[PDB]
Ligand binder design. Structure first.
Ligand SMILES: *[C@@H]1O[C@H](CO)[C@@H](O)[C@H](O)[C@H]1NC(C)=O
Ligand SMILES: *[C@@H]1O[C@H](CO)[C@@H](O)[C@H](O)[C@H]1NC(C)=O
Ligand SMILES: *[C@@H]1O[C@H](CO)[C@@H](O)[C@H](O)[C@H]1NC(C)=O
Ligand SMILES: *[C@@H]1O[C@H](CO)[C@@H](O)[C@H](O)[C@H]1NC(C)=O
Ligand SMILES: *[C@@H]1O[C@H](CO)[C@@H](O)[C@H](O)[C@H]1NC(C)=O
Ligand SMILES: *[C@@H]1O[C@H](CO)[C@@H](O)[C@H](O)[C@H]1NC(C)=O
Lengths: 167, 148, 175, 50
């Protein structure tokens, strides 16, 4: 990007410094903040095992120090598996991790359920013959716990000075 | 003061999440329990029969009783039937066949029957509908007169 | 010295993120087995070609979906620890559920929401959908070809309605 | 800290307007799509077919 003869350094819509002009040689440089991210830990139950898989989010694997590059980021400590299964511990952008073959933490592309096809035709009706009765169940919260909190005892430890300052 | 203000605000938001689940339960408790609901996938999963509420600590638990079909058998069909030029339609059901004869059944339980005038209603002529098939339609009112 | 303020914020925002994932899961994953339409399109005379997915395309997104997606920075705000996590379901998986619900609706009617899919000729299905709003079955068959034209023409205008002005998608564009 | 706390609160509220639309879309996809409705003016304007 080429500035004007006098204009020194640029900004963005949110007035953050983006470019700059070198003093000694009139050359134009771009500033990009050096990377950050949120370290995360994928683990099965402590009772089940003590192997964990670390996930750096939005960090290229080259700058991080088994690896794998997922759209979510870099994931070290887990093995990619071509086979696809139901999701166990979701990660990001369609990748699920689980604990099964000893066993190791496997990361895989999530499977959108099974696959099925039906035979539509000009003249084909399937009419069921037998039936079964089932019993489902679901739970709905109704009321949380009633509570009450008086201010003057919380803020002030029952002293005249604090009670007369809060007034 | 800031510490207490933040806690109060969160409660107001959280107490408005529950208020939308004590209204979706006070509704399921009405259609599901005190009546039969036709709202698909509201009460249970499948065709709905009844319900049974139960209590719980700060909540409620339902036991929906549902009806689901089991075994499906392929069959051939036809959206009408022509006997004497007049098309014939099922009053309530499909037209089904097993290769030799035709039969009329219910939508959700295989139970064949004889195609008589007692359960079909005529409409127009049979040169307009598509997919109609030739067949006979038995008449129930003939044999008793013939008996006499 | 300001205590545990950051932790509250991070807990709240993580709750929001998990909630968004559950929202999409609940809205779309109403079906358990992914169906798909037969190779032939003898649907009694209805041109579903706009809404069914088109193979001659990089993604499996159908025509109307493509139009909508065309109808509707990253590091600019990102300088200051404002990361934006990616959604769990990718925009291709979402377009896979949808192509199932369309496939199941056309070939099975509604009986695939209760048990398993049951084959039913489409021309016989709408006869049952009328029969639930009062008009007898004879109305459909006797005027089958007429309704096909109105229905096919109806999808004609909506495609032009979206591709005319950008004020049709006001609700999402506000978000 | 005030400004950061303001943005969070606005999110918490605004992220509950959506939760009242996901639970509404998730309904219409269960009556209108997977079945036929009788709720007048729910699935379209008029008698609903599919
Ligand atoms: C600074 O000095 C160097 C070396 O003499 C020269 O090449 C460069 O052009 C000078 N730049 C300016 C700003 O005068
Ligand atoms: C630990 O896991 C085993 C096997 O799943 C189970 O039998 C046992 O009850 C669990 N104990 C815990 C962690 O409570
Ligand atoms: C990671 O870094 C290498 C070297 O800079 C680069 O070639 C590659 O494209 C980068 N990959 C990502 C995910 O940005
Ligand atoms: C497994 O997945 C990787 C990454 O997509 C691919 O390169 C490889 O060919 C796949 N292998 C098999 C056995 O499908
Ligand atoms: C039945 O459907 C097939 C395509 O699946 C078609 O070739 C054939 O002509 C149709 N027959 C009738 C009865 O229309
Ligand atoms: C119905 O016919 C189709 C095609 O031949 C077949 O795939 C399917 O298994 C049959 N279903 C039953 C249960 O007869």
């Amino acid at each position: 990007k080429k500035f004007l003869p006098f204009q020194q350094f640029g900004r963005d819509i949110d007035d953050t410094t983006d470019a700059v002009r070198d003093p000694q040689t009139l050359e134009i440089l771009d500033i990009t903040p050096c990377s950050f991210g949120g370290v995360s830990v994928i683990t099965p139950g402590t009772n089940t095992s003590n192997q964990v898989a670390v996930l750096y989010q939005g960090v290229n694997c080259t700058e991080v120090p088994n690896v794998f590059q997922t759209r979510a980021g870099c994931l070290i400590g887990a093995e990619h598996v071509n086979n696809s299964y139901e999701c166990d511990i979701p990660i990001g952008a369609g990748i699920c991790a689980s604990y099964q073959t000893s066993q190791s933490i496997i990361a895989y592309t999530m499977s959108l359920g099974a696959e099925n096809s039906v035979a539509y035709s000009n003249n084909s009706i399937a009419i069921p013959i037998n039936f079964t009765i089932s019993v489902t169940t679901e739970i709905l919260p109704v009321s949380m716990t009633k509570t009450s909190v008086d201010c003057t005892m919380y803020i002030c430890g029952d002293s005249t000075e604090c009670s007369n300052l809060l007034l | 003061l800031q510490s207490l203000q933040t806690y109060v605000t969160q409660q107001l938001i959280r107490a408005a999440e529950i208020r939308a689940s004590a209204n979706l339960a006070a509704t399921k408790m009405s259609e599901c329990v005190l009546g039969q609901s036709k709202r698909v996938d509201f009460c249970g999963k499948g065709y709905h029969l009844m319900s049974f509420p139960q209590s719980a600590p700060h909540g409620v638990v339902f036991l929906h009783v549902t009806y689901v079909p089991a075994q499906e058998k392929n069959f051939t069909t036809a959206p009408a039937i022509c006997h004497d030029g007049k098309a014939h339609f099922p009053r309530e059901g499909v037209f089904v066949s097993n290769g030799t004869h035709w039969f009329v059944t219910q939508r959700n339980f295989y139970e064949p029957q004889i195609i008589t005038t007692h359960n079909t209603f005529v409409s127009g002529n049979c040169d307009v509908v598509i997919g109609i098939v030739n067949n006979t339609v038995y008449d129930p009112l003939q044999p008793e007169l013939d008996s006499f | 010295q300001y205590g545990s303020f950051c932790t509250q914020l991070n807990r709240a925002l993580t709750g929001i993120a998990v909630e968004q994932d559950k929202n999409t899961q609940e809205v779309f994953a109403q079906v358990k087995q992914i169906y798909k339409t037969p190779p032939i399109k003898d649907f009694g005379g209805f041109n579903f070609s706009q809404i069914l997915p088109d193979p001659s395309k990089p993604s499996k997104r159908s025509f109307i979906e493509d139009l909508l997606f065309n109808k509707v920075l990253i590091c600019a705000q990102k300088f200051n620890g404002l990361n934006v996590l990616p959604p769990l379901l990718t925009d291709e998986m979402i377009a896979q559920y949808t192509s199932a619900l369309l496939a199941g609706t056309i070939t099975s009617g509604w009986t695939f929401g209760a048990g398993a899919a049951l084959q039913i000729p489409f021309a016989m299905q709408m006869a049952y959908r009328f029969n639930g709003i009062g008009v007898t079955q004879n109305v459909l068959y006797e005027n089958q070809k007429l309704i096909a034209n109105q229905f096919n023409s109806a999808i004609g205008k909506i495609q032009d309605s979206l591709s005319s002005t950008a004020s049709a998608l006001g609700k999402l564009q506000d978000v």
